[model samples]
Target: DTFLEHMCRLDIDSPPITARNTGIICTIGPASRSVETLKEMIKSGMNVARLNFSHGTHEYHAETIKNVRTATESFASDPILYRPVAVALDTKGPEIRTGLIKGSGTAEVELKKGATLKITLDNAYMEKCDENILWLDYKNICKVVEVGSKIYVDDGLISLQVKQKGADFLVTEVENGGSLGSKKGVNLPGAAVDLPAVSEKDIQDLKFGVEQDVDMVFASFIRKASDVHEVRKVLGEKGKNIKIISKIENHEGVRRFDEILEASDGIMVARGDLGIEIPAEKVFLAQKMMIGRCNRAGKPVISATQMLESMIKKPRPTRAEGSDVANAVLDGADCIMLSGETAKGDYPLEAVRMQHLIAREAEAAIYHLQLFEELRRLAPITSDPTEATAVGAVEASFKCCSGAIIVLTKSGRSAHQVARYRPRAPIIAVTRNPQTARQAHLYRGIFPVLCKDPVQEAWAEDVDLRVNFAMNVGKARGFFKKGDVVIVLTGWRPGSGFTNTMRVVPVP
Candidate 1:
């Protein structure tokens, strides 16, 4: 009767705070960057704030980061009620673009068919270019591009075939001649780029991010594991705690993703360029594969790009778009990201509210009862005592029909382990560290509550107070009722990794 009683409806959704497991990441731009709009967006369930470096200046993103913090703080009624919204810096990873046409920086040039063109990395040519030669941002293309490689410029409006290679230059013949614009994006369809993972601009941005204390970095165009290591080097000691969320946007990224995933704290299935680089029809498969791998590995994976694209202009999403959002959650993504929809869209607020609805509905429809059993069946053994207990806690929650699981984590690893199993109930993670609290939003079902209440002299009493704080929040928010059952997962030792205890108790 216990399992079947709760099976008739979504008990969590009936509350004021809908228990949506999937995290919604909204990209901040001019449209949604204001303090007022950001506050409303947070209320509408935007868990992570994404800043696309491909579009904004350093000053621009810093201002938005300031606004996000101020907005999040406004909603705090007390120390226990604070909502932590994570700020993620989405880096523009190693994307190549042509120099300004004719040095005007705004002009265009036409390439005639069968004409020879020399693309150079000359420092002088970076400013001015003519039909004879052009400058590219990537300096290593001469080494990476081979003869007969197809080069696309202006988003493939024109094409060129590489015929000769030289030091810091490549000679190519125009195949599909057309007009090319200044600062046009260039794509090398088949060439495997050996470009530096963190370019000069990327290092500059990452250092600024460290200064700003950004929570996570969405490292774009990650081709290999070393790229992940390079990003960490740039983060250095100051930004060591910042999580690296790799973006798999192209062919090379997907081919070597296992290593990348192993090195990364999380992953983003970037479908915008993925659709461009791979067979357009196969983008869905790539997304599913990445999401599944991340789920199995116990890390968050975001399904990004064009989830609710129509909502960018129209107030309502198309049926297919709604279905797409639902499908991503069903396929096991921890987060769903919106790019232009929340950044430059006509209806930023509406997009967030709508995605919140879609995700909540989709989350309720997940077969979490069987899903938990299936995930546990697949994973039979583990090295960490923390993971084994997390698995047991989740399995116990589903079987006993618990309303919520409360965990006190220092480094956020314990909450992350519970999140991997996708339990039907939400995880109320109480933490003393603010960064850990912010990073908790990235993981699905982790409701991070920063315990800012003054600490007691005793450690066990401190744990008791934080656990009580989380439980009281759940009860008041209707995540748990007076007669409901709950699970409390805690650490056995003093440090971060000793989470081996679980207690089943009645709500009252």
Candidate 2:
């Protein structure tokens, strides 16, 4: 069946990317820093850009942001419809890493049971040593930590329980290890470490993010809601509007996720350290739970960590990895990220195209929008654009029997507009401003996400990205499923006078 011939198919500014499939997140690195490359990424179905703050300098990130904006402008894309490609600045958490090990590619230092390990400041500076103290990126490590806490080294390969400690730690082996080396990281899961939410580097980076006008900040290793609040404070009034994407990496972060998600603008289910902290088997369940909460809360939940690991080597994804990406979409992830796949892959653009193909195929089989009856009955009505977008979204959704609907707005006015419609299906409104998130709280059907990329384009020309972004974001929100119909509407065009545009694009 041709798209134009379909009874329910309508392509407009309102809902893009029919419900189904996870949106693609291309990490900003060497391979994707150029303006043309970034624009190609957006064209290749990469809706968001993840900037890992741990690896790059502010200058690099700033350039990446600049290039991203320039790509949108040069392409003359629709900012009102798509709001531009979002930029998510991932923060470096409070993990400890060992200093350099000289003259050795890799070394092993055994930590035997019942042995006292003397970790000295000098060990942290040692160029070569059998066993060395791993230094943290932050200098306030000792000041905040207490005695008798467990310190995990090298992604939990070894465990050391803090014993009689001074400024520098003399750790005792709680568990055993065969070899340890420098440049490895340490974890203080159970410790009351006095770690500030914002590091000196993070502060500088926050300034950079604010200056560059990045859309969202993925707060790393955020233990409590306070940690995000601390970062918000650093961002100040202008910074306060920046969406705080709390990454659930540690036990503490997981335990306090309810408050964290409520307080945060969005969330990232970062499974790397999460798997290291929790049992590998338990991570799936934790992920499901976290995803459910975020979905119910109407915030974006990005599934990250090795989704397409094989893409680093091969242009195409492995069968298992392919299913993994599809399953993330099935689990209702707003976005699925690729690290080495797009950041340092041999075929970055090809990998992105492959991701788009896989996601689109999976989305055709997965999109199904089922609105909550309770929400439908309780939803308020309004004539405002924000409220009307919500109402029209619901009306269009029910008319076409769509599984889910999405709204894209910078100020969240679009979300608020559609939210007033009280659509039976779930609504995911993509916005770059956190103020939109806060304002969207009143709308029942609308789930506001602080867009990592604010893509402002001529609504007329770039309607495709705007529409596709809405569908992908909605799919990531898990409101839409395969075989479901969707209605899209947009009010603001890039150069248009009024916010008047609507369309219906189906999955597959």
Candidate 3:
């Protein structure tokens, strides 16, 4: 109960108001594409919608984006309560995968152990793979892996060892066999695969995402720091502020994560393919370390794949799945996500709601005072002016038991700084930029309120309006009450960079 006491310092007679701190990122696909479904998804708990481009054409993605815009606007009946949904353009970076099955694109096949198989790179058979011949998209697959290297297909469910190599193919014997499906991911573990980090298709896709004005790029299979730089280069001038969130999957990618972490605006621990490349047992440790690093750097980290996986088919998730989400929240992950669960599942809404339930419960379970102390102590002593001031505001909030932290921000940087300290009450991030409001959801505990009204002629007058609006949002959400404590974090002046002031105001 004491742990719960730290989450919200409710007054003696005040009602309990619980709000989730962790963000939920849901994938948009056939299951949840329509404006109706997308609106429900957003209201359920979807802070970010992930557009997986691996299975869809640019035209399909454009349709989804338009629907998302419509759904976000559906809440216009409420005053300033409509939150614009943030779309993350998911790009599979230089991925190596098997071709579509023979006859139908969804056909399946099986390979028996001790049987010989032919994997091809010929364009003639690119999409004509059967039980005997398998077409691989990468032509140089024969050059990278030697005569005895291991091949893992479909997250290592099926295994093969090379016996010989041809000009554009590999003849191998199946060492382990399973049900093979269309376009499954192929991995050559322990081989120095020389595939380029960014392919030509990626450049075209980046250009398309730029045209559509997506909020972020969930870049998949990022191998090195250079991958992020090249991906950014393709974004060009239009996507200057678009966030690049690298997805680390392979062993080499893990080894080079330090550089990628610094280069990326955020990160996603792609545990699905990661387990296939590295040992399954070690993925937990890597995930913990990756989440830990992202937390310290104050960059959002989204832990994805299999997080409510069982909920894809069943209405209720397994006990372990619920525990999985709680652990991610306790581990300091900014966002928890569902891939196939919400993309191709029966209950997308339930999957998202479970995140809300589990995340709030987990937040309540955290020892807030202890966690804040550890975060403040571990913070780098070489802090900037804005960061140090943000720290002071969080400390003051705890000291006075503030119900909410109202932050006036332009770039949303101050909000992130306040969030890094994990204040007990939610941070009301008031901003004028819609994109910043959408992207701010990538961080935990930031409820971005877009200031739609015109900027006043007087500079400080605008600040007063933003503060009142933020207070209204806090009051509406049940975090603010009459005569309750509030922590107002704002700039000394305006424009940018001068986020160096703090104020204690009463809710009334």
Candidate 4:
């Protein structure tokens, strides 16, 4: 909340309002399904709408897509007149959950009561059994987990001891009192589990999303760079342009963040499971560390889970929670996410308002002198038209409080120039070539939108169609929300040049 709040107070001068941070990923659940509410979401800075496939049916997703498109039309988006909004479908990956419990369920049992229950890996859900011998689907534990190793499950309540090892069994004691529910996840901290990046369900989801023309894919429970490749293989050439965002959730990902950063178009710090698997304090540090590293790498990293959770019940957020939001922005997170806060919260709209408020507020307090100095130190001395154009645009974006800067590139050269400078504002590259769009995936914090024509130079060309293209494309792709002021960067000269001019434009 603080980030949004802080961001609002600052004097943001960038035009077309889609600059600075990412457009925002506002999870859509029942509370925000209405046309007006959806419009408000765009107004609230939602650049992307994430549809979590884990919770609803395909029909439900279809309806949300229609609603989003309808909302955009009613708003009269102008960049590309009739293009449908870009949609990102999230896939639930391979995970282990406890088995279903019996009637009225298993009560909390004492761990030290020498509670010996027969747990077996026999084709049954272990969490549901009244007996204590819980089962694991994989057999790699013997090689990864040693004897006497303590195991925790269901929020760390159902503790167990490594008593004995059988051909397909490992006995343990229920260390605490708690009823284990069906499909509850298994966590073996510091222990490796043989898990595939894609499960049977993920394959199905991938095909479904491709069939539906989803613009991006959020691969959940992702741990390695290989996982990203697997998804790419699944999507094939037609789906090649779809962005793949790796959700960093475990220790493995933390250790391999750079690899994942290089392999995927974007990254999401999924705090839900990360928080669950590690101590709270460590998880907090990990979030900041990951944000900073990703920022330096130029890959966009989103801070997710429970940001403004209090907004679900209360009209505002707790002060501490507000600080949390501020920390994320200061740490250089490219985006922030609201899970139950906006997905199924009682006050979804209020939650979004609070998020906007906090980000604006927190951003206002950050010191940019160092950032500016750093940029100056790294600034390239070049004379290439494209380079000059890029340098000029980045300079403008960094100067005079721009909201966000837009770069229209054909070869993605303009974008490459901006990337070289590393401006703080978000760079939305509009291009006609799929090649540029695909290659731009390698750059950090840069989102490439496909168009039939390359983004023209602001001064060299007429503003009417170009501006129309920027706004319509921005909205349809969920890059610009209703009141955003974004700076348009491109060459000023007609054919003699590259994109060199910068102009402030507002999204209507």
Query: If both were scored by TM-score, which would come out higher, candidate 3 or candidate 4?
Result: 3
Please estimate how well model 2 matches the true structure, expressed as its whole-model Cα lDDT. Answer: 0.66
Query: Which residue pairs in candidate 1 collide?
Result: none
- Candidate with more favorable, higher TM-score: 2 or 4: 4
Candidate 1 vs candidate 3: the lDDT winner is 1
lDDT of 1 by residue, 187-222 (tens): 887777766778898999999999999999999889
Top of the candidates by lDDT = 1
Q: Model 4 over residues 1-508: C-alpha lDDT tens digits?
A: 3445655766755433333343367788888878888887766666567888766777788898788767756744443533224467888776665555553343543334457654466756444465554555554565556666666676456766667756655676556645555545566766677767887778888888888777778898777788889998998887887778899888888888888888887788988678766777798788888876665555667788867878878878999888888678777676677877778878887877777667765555565545545655665576676666666666776664454567777667677557645566667777666556544544544666656544555644554555556666666766656677778876556554577677776777
At residue 256, what lDDT does model 1 achieve? 93
Q: What is the number of backbone collisions in each predicted candidate, taken in the order shown?
A: 0, 56, 0, 60
TM-scores for all candidates: the values are 0.86, 0.70, 0.94, 0.74
Candidate 3 runs further than 4 Å off:
1-17
Query: Against the hidden true structure, what lDDT does model 4 obtain?
Result: 0.68
Clashes of 3: 0
How well does candidate 3 match the true structure in TM-score terms? 0.94
Best by TM-score: 3
Distance from true location, Cα of 383 in model 2, Å: 13
Give the alpha carbon lDDT tens digit for every residue of 1-508 in model 2: 4333442544333443443235667887888888888878877766668898877677677878788778755644433324246677888766566655554647666656666665555544554545544444435556655677676777676777766667754545556665667667777665555656787888888878888777778888888888878888888897766777888987888889898997787778987778877778888888889976776656777788877768888877889888877766656666677888899877788888877766655544432433234344555553545444455556677778766565666666556445433354556666556546433532334555544444555445555665666666555556665667776656654644334555666764
Q: What TM-score does structure 2 among the candidates reach?
A: 0.70
1 or 2, greater by lDDT: 1
Give me the overall lDDT of model 3. 0.85
